[PDB]
Design a protein around this ligand. Structure first.
Ligand SMILES: Nc1ncnc2c1ncn2[C@@H]1O[C@H](COP(=O)(O)O)[C@@H](OP(=O)(O)O)[C@H]1O
Ligand SMILES: Oc1cccc2ccccc12
Length: 288
């Protein structure tokens, strides 16, 4: 059973056992100067932004963006599962210009990305909405350990004892990294509030000037209502052993503020007190 195993430490971070087993392959990953890296803590808008980028690269052509599932169009680099997937191999075999997905903390990113001075798009989301999304994802995406109850999972998240480690360190260190490398640092809530503005930021960062009509095509096709029903974007083509959408769909709610439906008032107050302590050494500002 490749599924439901305990996480394994890799350089201080809990990762899937099979990533740890194949870590040298990830560490030695060969980036290319024109790669665009999409980097996120899990559940922060990775799929959304990956689809936006693929739409940009295909000039808004919806059919071209249905050439394969999102997880093949934009490989999850470090995800290697015996018999099932190998993000490193998928990328090695992909013609440029590549779009690369990672969830690695800054300090674990393969050094080739730095040496190639790649452009990186980092997406962050408010911690309370992330932990809710992650709870349901742990349930449906069987590679994860059992999350336990919501209470148990919330405590594990606050302690950083979840896949890819603590949210707090992830977002803070990637934020600091923007001073060293070209990192467009975006917020899920901004994309919710004004997606046109945020896609324009992506276009500027990519040094692309496209017609308004193409921008509007990209906007339309990257909305939640469209993506949730799109089998090339909604993970429903995933092998059933890997993801059970009957437990929770990948495209679950796609809102900001679902935390209010999940947190008790006491959990919220406790989470906030803890949050303030952890985030005091960072300029970061989030909206819930
Ligand atoms: N086009 C879109 N607009 C808004 N949210 C989207 C979206 N596509 C995916 N999402 C949401 O992004 C989260 C998945 O993030 P990731 O791609 O990083 O795993 C899920 O959040 P919820 O579980 O809160 O609904 C999912 O519904
Ligand atoms: O984004 C992810 C994080 C962790 C595991 C995943 C498995 C499949 C597809 C996406 C995943």
């Amino acid at each position: 059973d490749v599924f439901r195993r305990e996480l394994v430490d890799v350089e201080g971070i809990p990762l899937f056992w099979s990533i740890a087993e194949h870590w040298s392959q990830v560490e030695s990953f060969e980036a290319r100067p024109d790669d665009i890296l999409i980097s996120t803590y899990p559940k922060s808008g990775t799929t959304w932004v990956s689809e936006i980028l693929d739409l940009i690269y295909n000039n808004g052509d919806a059919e071209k963006c249905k050439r394969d599932a999102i997880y093949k169009r934009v490989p999850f680099m470090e995800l290697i599962i015996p018999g099932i997937t190998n993000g490193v191999e998928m990328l090695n075999n992909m013609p440029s210009p590549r779009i690369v997905k990672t969830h690695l903390p800054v300090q674990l990113l393969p050094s080739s990305f730095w040496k190639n001075d790649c452009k990186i798009i980092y997406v962050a989301r408010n911690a309370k909405d992330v932990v809710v999304s992650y709870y349901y994802f742990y349930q449906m995406a069987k590679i994860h350990p059992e999350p336990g109850t919501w209470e148990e999972f919330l405590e594990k998240f606050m302690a950083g004892q979840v896949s890819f480690g603590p949210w707090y360190d992830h977002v803070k260190s990637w934020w600091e990294k923007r001073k060293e490398y070209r990192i467009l640092y975006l917020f899920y809530e901004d994309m919710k509030e004004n997606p046109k503005c945020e896609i324009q930021k992506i276009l500027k960062f990519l040094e692309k000037d496209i017609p308004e009509e193409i921008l509007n095509k990209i906007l339309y096709h990257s909305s939640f209502s469209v993506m949730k029903e799109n089998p090339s974007a909604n993970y429903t083509t995933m092998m059933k052993e890997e993801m059970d959408h009957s437990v929770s769909p990948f495209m679950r709610k796609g809102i900001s503020g679902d935390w209010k439906n999940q947190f008790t008032v006491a959990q919220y107050e406790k989470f906030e007190e803890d949050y303030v302590k952890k985030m005091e050494d960072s300029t970061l500002k989030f909206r819930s």
